[PDB]
Amino acid sequence: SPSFEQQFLNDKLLGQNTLQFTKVSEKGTADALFAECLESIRHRRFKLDPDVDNRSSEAVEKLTQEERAIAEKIFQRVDPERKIAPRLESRGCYIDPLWD
Amino acid sequence: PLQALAALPVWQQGTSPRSLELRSVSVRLAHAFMPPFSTETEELWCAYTRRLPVQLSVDLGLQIARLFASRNVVLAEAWKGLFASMDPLLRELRQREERESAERFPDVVLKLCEAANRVRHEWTWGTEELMLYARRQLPALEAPEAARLLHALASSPSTSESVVARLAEAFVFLWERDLSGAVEPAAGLQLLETLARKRATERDFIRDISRRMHCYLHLGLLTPFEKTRLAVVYRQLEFRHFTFFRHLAEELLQQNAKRQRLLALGRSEPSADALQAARQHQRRQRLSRLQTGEWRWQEYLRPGYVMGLGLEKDFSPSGVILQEEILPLVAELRRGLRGSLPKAFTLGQTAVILDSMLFLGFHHQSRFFGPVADVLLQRATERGAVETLDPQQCTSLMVFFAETRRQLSEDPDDCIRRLTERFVDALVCEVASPAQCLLFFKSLVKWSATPLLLAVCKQLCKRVHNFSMKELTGMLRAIAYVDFREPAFFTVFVNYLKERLGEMQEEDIANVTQAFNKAKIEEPHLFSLMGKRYQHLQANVMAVKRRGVLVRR
Amino acid sequence: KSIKKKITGTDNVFRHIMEESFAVLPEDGPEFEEDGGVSAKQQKSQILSE
Amino acid sequence: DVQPLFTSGQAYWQFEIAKSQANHLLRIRSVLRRMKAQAEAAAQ
Amino acid sequence: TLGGHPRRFKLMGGRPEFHHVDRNKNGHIIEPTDKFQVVITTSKNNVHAQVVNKSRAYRTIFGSFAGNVGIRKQAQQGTQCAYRIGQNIARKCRRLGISQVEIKFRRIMRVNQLLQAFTAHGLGVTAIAHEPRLPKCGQNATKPRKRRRV
RNA sequence: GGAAGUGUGUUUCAAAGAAAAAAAA
């Protein structure tokens, strides 16, 4: 059962950035056992999942160009020495782990 | 001569199974008896092929193609007729397979293209059909079939590099894990060769395959044939691996050291070249039992033979442990490091390996090249060794001498002359490719800077459409710098160059002007056209004095 | 490069350092870590398990 | 329907990026399951 | 009104084109692998254009000016003279076998005409360089000339 | 040293040049 990283993240663009969502635990630990149980249960529930859970909405412009310019200026003022970027690795600092 | 061709059962016109069986037996006996195609045997092959529009079978056509590949039948008419008579069978098979879904056609077409590549003949229709099949059904093929199709397409000389690279990228995306986890040396080597032949950028996959091959080499499960092929493919890739080539140099040095150790004493082992010559003699005897340099040419043209590596069957794994000292050269170990964050080479094989090292530039920035170069000089200057060599191995030796001009302790002028005679015999007998020939000639000119030539010139004059402006102009310069001074031989090519004005690069124009300024020959129109071409080509470069080149293109 | 405009006779100390490094880290080895630097280690410390 | 409130604009930037990625994955999953259903119906 | 330099025309030794130009050891004025640069020196009264082979240590091949093209006195100040000089340079480059050149100059006035003539007559330009060599020491390190009209 | 190239650490020219215009080939 190849995972998403096994399947698609070997491409250049897809493989460039790959965030980590869960801590890696060595085999033989309570965390590993619980992760295995959760993965099995989630796969079985994915099998017994309904259609409504995969509903998607059309993509639209999140911001206007002028609003994007304003946001860029404000982010630059927030960090005037560094470049503005979505530092998804440093994400935990800005968004609490429980609300990721 | 001519008795076998007169007596063979060739006179029977019909579609009968008896006729087909008699044709199959006739071609079997042709394979057994007829000599390789060359200067000496030309009329025989012409007449045989002309006699052989015509009704054939799949097996018969495959046998004909294999025989032509083995015997180097490069005559255009023979292939023209063979494809003209094959078109009906292939079309019928294609329609049959199409209707069934709505031998095998792709397999037959691939085999024909392989034969055409072997004889260096181009089959545009077959190559295009294979390209369409690849673009249409690449995901369908399993890993080995896809690898074979990609290798054939890359070996083809007209397939577009961009398209081949995109197909290789898709293949890697599909089967990077299984191959990189468990791939045999032969499959990995073929993958590396197909990547190199079209310059596909697969850095990570190439590195992983190289790591697995190096694990094989460390374990000692690799033959000299495979090691030389690895060196050649790394040279093609410009893969400047340091530890691998240091390991090869150390292997050569220790082999020579043991050779001398046992030669000093009363008991010594036979030489690898001696064993190869004995095996070649045994194969010649086997052929005679079944029935100038025909007995060597057949051995070189045997199906399992590779130009710079001899015959793949003779060579076997080097040994579990070959270096007593710790070798200069696995996935679990890679994972651990990431987590922790801390049986013998031939003379020609040695020549090819050192040619690869010279191309990669080890001779300058290395400490393990000088001793091996001295060893190669010692083994090459000996009489007899140069005579039994391939055109590509001779080119490698010539390159080695030319590059290590100064480093040579002695002056092997006799060895160089004998090598040149051997290579010229190969060239006039058509076993030498223009790519291997231009390198040899340029290397000889470089070595000399600081009859045989007539035969070379006549071969060049008769075979003009086999190579590109690169080789044409480079050889035109090499002959003039060797010293030819033939107004006719030089003025012949003026019109050919005028016609192929377009395909001339800066290197090409440089070679042409060098040749025609060394030969003291005047051609105002040629020079004017070449000058305009050079101006146009350089129009997309700007440079300033004392500041180098600023913007290119 | 021109012989009258380049630098010759200098030691390839960087190449020697690379060659000696090959000993501690095999040349046929990983080029990066599981966590690629300060940012990756921050992510590792700031991601929860299950 | 109700989304959280953060103290910095970085958080909203990353939240929007995550939302877009999740929606694209949802579209892919829906298309895959529709193809699954079509294949099952054709087989039966 | 010969449209050329009267004295060069009169003393032309049998009229072999490029008879007086020194040639390489190979007997060629131009090698098939040579690049060419046109240096233009413009002024109020005249424009001097020199074609130079860069490969032969930036060696002048031939040149032209108002007198060479057959323009005398006040007529040398107009744009017609500059365009005529450009046309002459382009035509002689075509005759020799020069197609692509690099332009260089110090004063930019009266250079547009030469560039336009080159483009019209097919003398391609691969690059342009303005080398004014401005003073980097002062303004009156050497007292310049007196201003006209007091 | 000038100008370039890429089987290389390669080649070529070389210690001032320039003596109508416009064409043919």
Side-chain angles (χ1 to χ4, degrees):
Chain A
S1 61
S3 295
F4 189 90
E5 63 280 2
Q6 305 293 359
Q7 293 287 50
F8 307 94
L9 295 185
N10 284 323
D11 179 10
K12 303 170 186 175
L13 292 181
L14 284 59
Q16 269 178 6
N17 301 332
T18 60
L19 317 176
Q20 274 198 358
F21 315 94
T22 56
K23 288 192 183 304
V24 184
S25 185
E26 65 281 10
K27 179 182 175 183
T29 53
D31 298 56
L33 279 304
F34 185 67
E36 178 184 2
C37 291
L38 288 188
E39 287 181 352
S40 64
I41 295 171
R42 281 200 292 266
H43 274 242
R44 295 194 182 89
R45 288 171 67 164
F46 299 163
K47 295 182 182 180
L48 291 182
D49 262 0
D51 191 322
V52 295
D53 291 0
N54 63 32
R55 74 186 191 279
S56 63
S57 55
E58 292 171 324
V60 67
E61 298 187 16
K62 303 152 176 180
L63 292 172
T64 316
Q65 291 299 285
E66 291 75 356
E67 301 183 7
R68 185 207 174 194
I70 288 171
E72 289 176 326
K73 295 188 193 306
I74 297 171
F75 280 111
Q76 193 63 90
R77 295 219 63 182
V78 176
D79 301 341
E81 71 287 347
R82 190 173 52 183
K83 286 304 304 179
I84 67 185
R87 304 175 188 89
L88 310 169
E89 299 78 357
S90 73
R91 190 57 50 245
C93 304
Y94 300 90
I95 293 177
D96 190 300
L98 293 181
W99 290 24
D100 291 354
Chain B
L2 65 63
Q3 52 175 336
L5 76 77
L8 282 177
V10 62
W11 52 94
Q12 186 166 355
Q13 187 75 245
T15 69
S16 59
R18 295 289 300 278
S19 177
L20 289 178
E21 293 296 346
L22 267 73
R23 295 292 296 278
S24 67
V25 173
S26 74
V27 295
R28 183 187 302 273
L29 273 65
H31 180 284
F33 288 104
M34 296 175 69
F37 181 90
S38 59
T39 306
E40 175 266 335
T41 38
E42 189 280 345
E43 305 296 357
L44 165 152
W45 278 108
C46 183
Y48 177 82
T49 56
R50 180 170 294 95
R51 179 167 292 276
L52 273 75
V54 177
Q55 297 77 0
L56 306 170
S57 180
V58 59
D59 185 6
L60 181 55
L62 295 169
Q63 293 297 105
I64 291 167
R66 179 176 295 92
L67 182 156
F68 292 172
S70 182
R71 300 297 183 182
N72 188 25
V73 181
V74 303
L75 181 58
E77 300 296 339
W79 294 98
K80 184 72 175 298
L82 176 58
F83 293 156
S85 63
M86 177 64 68
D87 165 66
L89 304 169
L90 291 177
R91 183 181 300 275
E92 293 291 355
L93 180 55
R94 183 180 68 183
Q95 296 302 330
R96 180 59 56 85
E97 299 299 344
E98 183 67 18
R99 63 169 296 277
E100 191 282 340
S101 181
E103 301 290 6
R104 286 186 175 180
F105 182 82
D107 191 63
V108 177
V109 178
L110 198 59
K111 295 169 70 182
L112 288 181
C113 290
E114 288 173 0
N117 296 334
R118 272 285 299 176
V119 297
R120 302 184 185 88
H121 178 257
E122 80 300 344
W123 187 20
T124 62
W125 187 81
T127 55
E128 291 181 9
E129 200 164 30
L130 280 179
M131 176 270 294
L132 270 300
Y133 175 70
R135 292 180 62 269
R136 180 183 57 185
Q137 295 287 338
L138 189 73
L141 281 301
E142 295 296 337
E145 299 294 355
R148 188 170 122 89
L149 181 62
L150 290 178
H151 187 91
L153 195 72
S155 302
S156 181
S158 59
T159 56
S160 49
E161 76 300 342
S162 61
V163 174
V164 179
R166 190 176 297 93
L167 291 168
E169 180 182 5
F171 170 91
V172 174
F173 182 93
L174 281 171
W175 295 281
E176 73 292 355
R177 291 179 287 156
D178 187 3
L179 287 170
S180 61
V183 59
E184 262 53 18
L189 212 27
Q190 290 189 356
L191 291 173
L192 294 171
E193 284 183 340
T194 179
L195 293 172
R197 204 157 296 178
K198 290 290 174 178
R199 297 161 50 264
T201 59
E202 303 297 347
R203 170 166 165 78
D204 296 67
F205 186 63
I206 299 173
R207 287 176 52 88
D208 210 350
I209 295 292
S210 301
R211 188 222 81 261
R212 187 168 177 84
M213 296 296 85
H214 297 161
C215 286
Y216 265 101
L217 177 49
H218 166 84
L219 294 175
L221 312 178
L222 222 69
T223 82
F225 180 95
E226 291 176 343
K227 282 182 284 187
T228 308
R229 207 174 175 194
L230 253 77
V232 178
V233 66
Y234 285 173
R235 169 261 171 273
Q236 288 181 293
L237 291 171
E238 305 193 12
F239 194 80
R240 298 163 177 267
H241 207 274
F242 186 84
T243 64
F244 171 77
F245 281 95
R246 171 159 140 263
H247 177 85
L248 295 189
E250 180 62 15
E251 289 292 6
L252 296 174
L253 281 171
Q254 287 201 0
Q255 175 179 129
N256 197 36
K258 176 177 174 180
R259 185 195 189 92
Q260 269 48 78
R261 281 184 172 182
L262 297 185
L263 182 64
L265 306 180
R267 47 174 294 182
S268 59
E269 305 289 12
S271 180
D273 291 331
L275 301 191
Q276 298 157 52
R279 222 69 64 92
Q280 299 152 11
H281 183 90
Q282 292 173 10
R283 282 147 185 174
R284 293 151 54 177
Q285 166 273 327
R286 185 80 73 263
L287 270 180
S288 68
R289 183 197 62 78
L290 290 170
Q291 294 165 21
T292 301
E294 296 160 337
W295 39 86
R296 318 157 194 264
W297 267 224
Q298 61 187 11
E299 202 287 334
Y300 295 160
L301 295 174
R302 295 185 184 278
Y305 198 90
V306 190
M307 289 267 70
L309 310 84
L311 196 79
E312 185 173 14
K313 321 308 176 187
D314 283 351
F315 304 107
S316 316
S318 301
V320 177
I321 305 294
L322 185 57
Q323 271 186 26
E324 282 293 349
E325 66 187 37
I326 304 303
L327 290 69
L329 196 68
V330 54
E332 71 185 9
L333 188 70
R334 279 169 47 193
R335 289 182 286 269
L337 296 176
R338 198 176 181 88
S340 184
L341 316 185
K343 292 189 165 293
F345 303 90
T346 89
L347 182 63
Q349 290 188 358
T350 300
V352 177
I353 292 167
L354 301 207
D355 187 16
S356 301
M357 294 174 61
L358 290 166
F359 187 82
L360 298 180
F362 279 93
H363 62 297
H364 291 329
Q365 291 76 31
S366 68
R367 279 186 170 275
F368 59 83
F369 174 76
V372 176
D374 303 336
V375 177
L376 172 55
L377 171 60
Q378 174 185 338
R379 290 190 177 183
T381 301
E382 300 171 4
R383 301 180 181 181
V386 158
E387 310 305 339
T388 61
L389 286 177
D390 314 46
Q392 188 267 6
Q393 300 177 352
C394 292
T395 301
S396 298
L397 249 175
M398 189 72 264
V399 170
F400 165 79
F401 288 140
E403 292 199 47
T404 57
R405 266 181 296 183
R406 280 74 180 189
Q407 280 185 324
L408 287 170
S409 61
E410 57 190 6
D411 180 66
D413 194 331
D414 170 74
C415 188
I416 288 168
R417 186 187 55 78
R418 292 182 294 104
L419 194 74
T420 310
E421 291 188 18
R422 174 60 169 186
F423 174 81
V424 173
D425 187 358
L427 173 56
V428 300
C429 291
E430 301 286 350
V431 177
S433 54
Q436 300 171 351
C437 176
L438 177 109
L439 183 60
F440 181 93
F441 288 167
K442 190 174 180 179
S443 177
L444 185 149
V445 176
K446 182 179 179 181
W447 177 83
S448 67
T450 304
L452 184 145
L453 48 95
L454 191 76
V456 163
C457 119
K458 299 291 161 62
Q459 173 65 1
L460 165 52
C461 290
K462 60 170 65 182
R463 296 284 185 274
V464 174
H465 301 277
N466 286 92
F467 45 87
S468 55
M469 307 299 290
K470 171 66 175 179
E471 289 79 356
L472 181 73
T473 64
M475 289 206 302
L476 248 52
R477 180 190 174 279
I479 300 301
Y481 273 68
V482 162
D483 290 322
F484 206 51
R485 301 171 187 173
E486 285 298 344
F489 171 80
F490 283 116
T491 192
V492 155
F493 289 99
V494 70
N495 291 272
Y496 183 87
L497 295 173
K498 290 179 193 301
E499 186 174 29
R500 294 186 184 270
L501 172 79
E503 294 77 359
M504 300 184 67
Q505 302 285 99
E506 300 90 355
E507 60 184 0
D508 304 333
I509 180 181
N511 297 326
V512 173
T513 208
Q514 308 249 323
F516 295 155
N517 289 122
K518 189 67 178 301
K520 301 293 296 183
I521 296 170
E522 299 287 336
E523 291 298 345
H525 290 286
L526 167 98
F527 282 174
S528 185
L529 297 175
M530 284 193 302
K532 284 182 64 174
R533 177 60 178 175
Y534 184 89
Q535 303 271 281
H536 177 275
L537 287 176
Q538 288 293 291
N540 64 19
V541 178
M542 185 182 64
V544 182
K545 198 194 290 178
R546 308 188 177 91
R547 296 175 63 176
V549 69
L550 298 170
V551 294
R552 183 172 296 280
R553 132 179 306 282
Chain C
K1 300 180 71 60
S2 296
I3 300 301
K4 286 190 177 295
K5 302 182 182 182
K6 66 169 290 191
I7 305 178
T8 308
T10 62
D11 296 66
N12 275 324
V13 62
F14 39 88
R15 313 302 294 187
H16 309 342
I17 294 159
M18 186 97 69
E19 294 168 357
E20 187 70 351
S21 307
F22 291 153
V24 298
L25 179 71
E27 187 175 7
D28 301 65
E31 297 182 356
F32 297 94
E33 315 85 342
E34 191 178 3
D35 299 1
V38 186
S39 186
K41 293 181 182 304
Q42 183 180 227
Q43 177 179 254
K44 191 208 75 177
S45 63
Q46 292 188 351
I47 59 178
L48 296 169
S49 65
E50 285 295 350
Chain D
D1 192 2
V2 177
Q3 287 169 352
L5 288 172
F6 302 110
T7 56
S8 53
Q10 204 72 18
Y12 294 109
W13 196 355
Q14 41 241 32
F15 211 90
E16 184 58 31
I17 291 173
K19 168 182 174 183
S20 62
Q21 288 177 10
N23 281 273
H24 179 41
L25 290 175
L26 287 168
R27 172 55 179 274
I28 284 172
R29 193 217 187 189
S30 64
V31 178
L32 291 176
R33 277 207 170 186
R34 177 248 300 279
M35 288 184 177
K36 180 78 67 161
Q38 286 190 354
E40 277 289 0
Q44 293 189 359
Chain E
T1 61
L2 78 179
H5 197 291
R7 282 205 169 187
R8 298 184 178 180
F9 166 72
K10 184 187 293 184
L11 280 60
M12 198 67 177
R15 314 214 161 81
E17 204 281 339
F18 253 61
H19 60 89
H20 200 284
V21 171
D22 305 10
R23 302 183 165 72
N24 251 123
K25 63 178 184 180
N26 302 333
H28 305 293
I29 307 128
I30 290 167
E31 197 63 28
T33 61
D34 289 357
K35 296 187 176 187
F36 304 86
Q37 179 179 114
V38 189
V39 185
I40 305 88
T41 290
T42 62
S43 64
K44 171 177 173 291
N45 291 324
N46 192 323
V47 178
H48 298 263
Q50 306 294 339
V51 184
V52 311
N53 184 342
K54 301 165 58 178
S55 297
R56 298 186 67 185
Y58 286 76
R59 169 174 298 195
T60 301
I61 318 180
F62 67 95
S64 180
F65 50 98
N68 192 37
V69 301
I71 301 170
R72 295 86 185 181
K73 302 296 189 179
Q74 62 183 91
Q76 308 173 212
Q77 306 180 46
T79 58
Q80 302 186 27
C81 178
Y83 197 77
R84 182 69 184 86
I85 294 171
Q87 288 188 140
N88 202 120
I89 296 288
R91 290 163 174 170
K92 292 205 71 170
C93 286
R94 185 184 61 255
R95 295 168 201 174
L96 265 58
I98 305 166
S99 56
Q100 311 294 273
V101 292
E102 280 187 354
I103 302 296
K104 202 187 77 172
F105 57 101
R106 189 180 191 185
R107 275 62 57 84
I108 197 169
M109 55 95 71
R110 297 170 57 82
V111 175
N112 53 8
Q113 267 59 82
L114 277 70
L115 181 63
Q116 183 170 357
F118 296 174
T119 304
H121 288 244
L123 182 60
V125 178
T126 67
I128 303 180
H130 185 183
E131 310 239 344
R133 295 194 302 102
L134 292 172
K136 217 171 184 178
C137 61
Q139 182 171 340
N140 291 329
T142 56
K143 185 168 178 180
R145 201 162 184 275
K146 191 212 302 183
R147 286 193 175 182
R148 297 188 58 186
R149 229 67 55 82
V150 174

